[PDB]
Amino acid sequence: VMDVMNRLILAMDLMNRDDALRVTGEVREYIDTVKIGYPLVLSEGMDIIAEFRKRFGCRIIADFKVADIPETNEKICRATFKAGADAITVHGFPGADSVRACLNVAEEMGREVFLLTEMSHPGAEMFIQGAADEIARMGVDLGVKNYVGPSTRPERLSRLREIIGQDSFLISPGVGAQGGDPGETLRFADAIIVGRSIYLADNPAAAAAGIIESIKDLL
Amino acid sequence: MDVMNRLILAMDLMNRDDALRVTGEVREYIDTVKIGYPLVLSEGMDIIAEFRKRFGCRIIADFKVADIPETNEKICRATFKAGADAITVHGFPGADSVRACLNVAEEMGREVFLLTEMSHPGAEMFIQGAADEIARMGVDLGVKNYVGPSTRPERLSRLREIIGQDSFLISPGVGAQGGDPGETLRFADAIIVGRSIYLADNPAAAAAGIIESIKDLL
Ligand SMILES: O=c1cnn([C@@H]2O[C@H](COP(=O)(O)O)[C@@H](O)[C@H]2O)c(=O)[nH]1
Ligand SMILES: O=c1cnn([C@@H]2O[C@H](COP(=O)(O)O)[C@@H](O)[C@H]2O)c(=O)[nH]1
């Protein structure tokens, strides 16, 4: 599995290149894994991945939540890996063919897929929560090794960990701004994803260091 | 939304020159182009403005927005800043995620298209069983524009029933995925067509042929 420094992944959702680079640079001593999503990519271009690689010693997870038909999913994954992303996130709710399309490209291209199981926001209760255990089981059957699950629902995160097994890699957003606790989340997740609690802080480095201090015995 | 010839081009070529050339070849037949991540992630969001400059066509950004509310808002803002007239949004992530998109669309004078049931085989696993409820959620939220599957006209018909005749419904899965243009237009206001046009030996003839086949419906 990827070796995530300090079990902490920065969710870099600032939408301005200068601010995104400044903040990421400020926390780089604490974090070697950065999640870049559509807020930044659609604002600054896919070349932002190249820029981050050039500036920082960071792996890049492209959080694109791929959710199209198999043929379009393949194209999205190809473009994303061509740009230099180490990994891409993929929704499971569109079904096994859509997931398989992404896995096939990732295999061919030597990169990784993260399967999104249950999401951390309130609306996830409406449809996703009821499908999530089956989505996770589907991932296991398809050979998915990397998963995303919700910090905001420890009971759900624990169940999802059970389903995927201890050998699978699990990362978890919803820590901080959405209400999730770093320590409790790391009982089940390999790494926590943190965005606003760091990138909106007056001192993002101090914010990151504070989170890390609070989980030091878990490192 | 008034779509010329009830036909929306799905421009999923991933090279700028080819995308512009092929769109140019079929421009007399359409005034609405769906641009998705295959083209945008290959050539950048500036491609949207370029299409508007060259063709004046309406642009639907088929981004299938599927994040938490806060991220959805940011995705919609970036997308509309680039000049998209509309954006597609998954309903599966729930009502708050959809509302986030509706808010930005209202603010910027744009439209949200709610994706109800998808057209590929995997849609049967989870989406199909939620789709009627997703459509009712759209109605509850005041959504006026919807996407449903050409490949299952009985499901497309049910979705039309739920949303009513006043709502606007577009439908992909025509041609390559097996759906029929005329049958789909029994229920949808417009059909989305990608590969059957953009992979054709002669895209203009392909478009003309589709339109010929539905001429009585225009
Ligand atoms: O279920 C979820 C919830 N959030 N996120 C993403 O993780 C980050 C959460 O950031 P935050 O710490 O500012 O809440 C954002 O990029 C959000 O899109 C997910 O991928 N899945
Ligand atoms: O349920 C679906 C099925 N397809 N599409 C999109 O519509 C287009 C279908 O193209 P095609 O005519 O080449 O199959 C592609 O861009 C695909 O991502 C959807 O939005 N929803």
Side-chain angles (χ1 to χ4, degrees), chain A residues 67-73 75-76, chain B residues 8-12 34-38 62-64 88 90 115 117-120 123 127 147-152 170-178 192-199:
Chain A
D68 218 300
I69 68 175
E71 290 86 344
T72 295
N73 281 8
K75 294 176 175 144
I76 293 171
Chain B
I8 299 172
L9 174 68
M11 179 37 64
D12 299 312
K34 187 177 76 62
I35 295 181
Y37 286 135
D62 183 15
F63 291 175
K64 298 191 171 58
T88 60
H90 266 296
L115 176 57
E117 178 170 333
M118 290 177 71
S119 64
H120 66 299
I127 291 175
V147 187
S150 173
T151 52
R152 304 187 193 95
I170 68 179
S171 183
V174 177
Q177 298 178 59
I192 293 163
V193 179
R195 287 165 286 173
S196 291
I197 293 169
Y198 75 69
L199 290 187

Side-chain angles (χ1 to χ4, degrees), chain A residues 65 67-68 91 94 97 121 123, chain B residues 64 66-67 90 93 96 120 122 198:
Chain A
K65 298 191 172 58
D68 218 300
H91 265 297
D97 54 357
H121 67 298
Chain B
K64 298 191 171 58
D67 219 299
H90 266 296
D96 55 355
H120 66 299
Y198 75 69

Side-chain angles (χ1 to χ4, degrees), chain A residues 9-13 35-37 39 63 65 89 91 116 118-121 124 148-153 172-179 193-200, chain B residues 66-68 70-72 74-75:
Chain A
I9 299 172
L10 176 67
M12 179 35 62
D13 298 311
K35 185 178 78 64
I36 295 180
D63 187 11
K65 298 191 172 58
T89 62
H91 265 297
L116 179 55
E118 182 167 330
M119 291 176 72
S120 62
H121 67 298
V148 188
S151 172
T152 52
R153 301 188 194 94
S172 183
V175 177
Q178 296 177 63
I193 292 163
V194 180
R196 287 167 286 173
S197 289
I198 292 168
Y199 72 69
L200 295 182
Chain B
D67 219 299
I68 67 176
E70 288 83 353
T71 297
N72 279 10
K74 293 178 160 181
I75 294 174

Side-chain angles (χ1 to χ4, degrees), chain A residues 68-205:
Chain A
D68 218 300
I69 68 175
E71 290 86 344
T72 295
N73 281 8
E74 291 178 357
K75 294 176 175 144
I76 293 171
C77 292
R78 290 188 187 286
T80 297
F81 297 140
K82 179 177 180 178
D86 294 276
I88 196 172
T89 62
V90 178
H91 265 297
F93 73 80
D97 54 357
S98 285
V99 176
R100 191 175 303 109
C102 300
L103 292 171
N104 289 343
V105 175
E107 177 72 14
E108 168 184 338
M109 303 188 65
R111 305 291 163 82
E112 301 200 278
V113 162
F114 280 70
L115 183 64
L116 179 55
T117 62
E118 182 167 330
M119 291 176 72
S120 62
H121 67 298
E125 288 177 357
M126 292 188 29
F127 304 108
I128 290 171
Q129 179 170 89
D133 289 355
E134 185 175 348
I135 289 169
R137 188 166 77 253
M138 176 191 72
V140 173
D141 193 45
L142 292 175
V144 173
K145 300 185 67 178
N146 305 291
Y147 298 82
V148 188
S151 172
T152 52
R153 301 188 194 94
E155 77 283 7
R156 298 293 305 131
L157 191 65
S158 175
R159 178 67 191 131
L160 292 161
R161 165 58 76 188
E162 289 173 355
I163 294 164
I164 67 179
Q166 308 305 136
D167 286 354
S168 296
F169 193 64
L170 176 60
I171 66 179
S172 183
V175 177
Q178 296 177 63
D181 178 79
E184 288 304 307
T185 303
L186 290 174
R187 292 172 62 192
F188 311 110
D190 295 280
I192 49 174
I193 292 163
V194 180
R196 287 167 286 173
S197 289
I198 292 168
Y199 72 69
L200 295 182
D202 287 343
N203 185 342

